[PDB]
Amino acid sequence: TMDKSELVQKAKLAEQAERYDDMAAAMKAVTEQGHELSNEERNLLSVAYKNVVGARRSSWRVISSIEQKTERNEKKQQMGKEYREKIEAELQDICNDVLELLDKYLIPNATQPESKVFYLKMKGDYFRYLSEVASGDNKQTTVSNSQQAYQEAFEISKKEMQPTHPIRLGLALNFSVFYYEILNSPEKACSLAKTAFDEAIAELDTLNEESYKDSTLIMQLLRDNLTLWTSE
Amino acid sequence: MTMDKSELVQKAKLAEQAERYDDMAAAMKAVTEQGHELSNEERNLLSVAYKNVVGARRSSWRVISSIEQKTERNEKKQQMGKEYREKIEAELQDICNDVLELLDKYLIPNATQPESKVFYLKMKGDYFRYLSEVASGDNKQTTVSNSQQAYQEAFEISKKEMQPTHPIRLGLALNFSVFYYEILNSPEKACSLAKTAFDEAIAELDTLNEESYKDSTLIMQLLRDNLTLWTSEN
């Protein structure tokens, strides 16, 4: 039963030591005390799970790729399948953990739009990661929950934050990638990405020093996707 | 659930590609525990797995230690760093202990070829040295001593079973001489070990093949290099 200061300091030590499971466990405990997280605490939570889930996603695609290679030995095929499944179950546990934190503590206790959008975007991301390894029927539910979360985030971000805000831009980035990669709709992905990019560059006066680099980084990622998707 | 050896090796290789080294180590641990001499592929997978598993904790340990020295004394920032280092130290001790048990229970006694036996003894030396980096004052001399003993025994076997120019033996001479200089702070003995190994190989240079000599001479050069470096220090 550590207090937040100690758990955050542990999270930061774990991050420097590249021990992200520890970092996630720390920030999960912080989150479970049921209080609104600071920007720093929220970033630490986000980075921890980004790394914890990202490692499985990378692993999952490495194994899925190896499964496509010609293989005549049945035991090796089974090992590939069972190892993929092992990773999927880990991925499912991680996402379920994240989505529970969001549903039980983070989203309902959020009193400021910035956080609400951040957490809803997160809900969208983690339901998307679930959907990538989902079995069918659960596949449609997860894809649909992802879309609903992004959509809710998006509507709030348009009312409550500047078009150049990193969270709003990041949401447009991920939501547009969702449309292209998960929903297989270039038309929806391009509409959203173009809208968010155009809205940003129409309001360069909303940029600020503190987030200038994050803003312009994500704006360029949006432009890059648009160019790629328009080339098809 | 309950995998055979073909399954565990394939899992290890899949784990390696997926960068899931704990899984890779777990798989090759189970293979080793079946009690048979490992093939070269199997031995390589085991070695690489544990190298990565222990490597991660050693890197983590060094990072936390640096942070620790930078911090002020009256702070809790010292306390949390102390407990996190100790958590990493215990994980390290556990990994090393697992490897050492594998080596003494299965790998070393079942080795029927001198190359394998020497490989496993050199590992034993390595994992004792890793333990010695995080061992407390009292415990530290024993670990360094067990490390020395393992390297020694590997080196002795190489002297009996391999030619002076054999790269495994030369590689053992190099590691062993540097161990004396760096860990035991015994530069005179370090020079003596280097010189002996270098001289013994030189005496048999003429027997090497023209197309492969570099496999030996590259290591002999390093032995020569250390000898010059060390004997220039008054």
From Swiss-Prot, chain B:
PTM comment, free text: The alpha, brain-specific form differs from the beta form in being phosphorylated. Phosphorylated on Ser-60 by protein kinase C delta type catalytic subunit in a sphingosine-dependent fashion.
GO molecular function term, any single one: identical protein binding
Location of this chain's protein in the cell: Cytoplasm; Melanosome; Vacuole membrane
One Gene Ontology term from the biological process aspect of the record: protein targeting
Family: Belongs to the 14-3-3 family.
Positions carrying Phosphothreonine: T2
PROSITE patterns: 1433_1, 1433_2
Modified positions (N6-acetyllysine) in chain numbering: K5, K51, K70, K117
Role description: Adapter protein implicated in the regulation of a large spectrum of both general and specialized signaling pathways. Binds to a large number of partners, usually by recognition of a phosphoserine or phosphothreonine motif. Binding generally results in the modulation of the activity of the binding partner. Negative regulator of osteogenesis. Blocks the nuclear translocation of the phosphorylated form (by AKT1) of SRPK2 and antagonizes its stimulatory effect on cyclin D1 expression resulting in blockage of neuronal apoptosis elicited by SRPK2.
Modified residues (N-acetylmethionine): M1
PANTHER family (UniProt xref): 14-3-3 PROTEIN (PTHR18860)
Record flagged with keyword ATP-binding: no
Cross-link type Glycyl lysine isopeptide (Lys-Gly) (interchain with G-Cter in SUMO2), residue numbers: K51
Protein name: 14-3-3 protein beta/alpha
Gene3D superfamilies with a match to the protein in the record: 14-3-3 domain
One GO CC term, this protein: focal adhesion
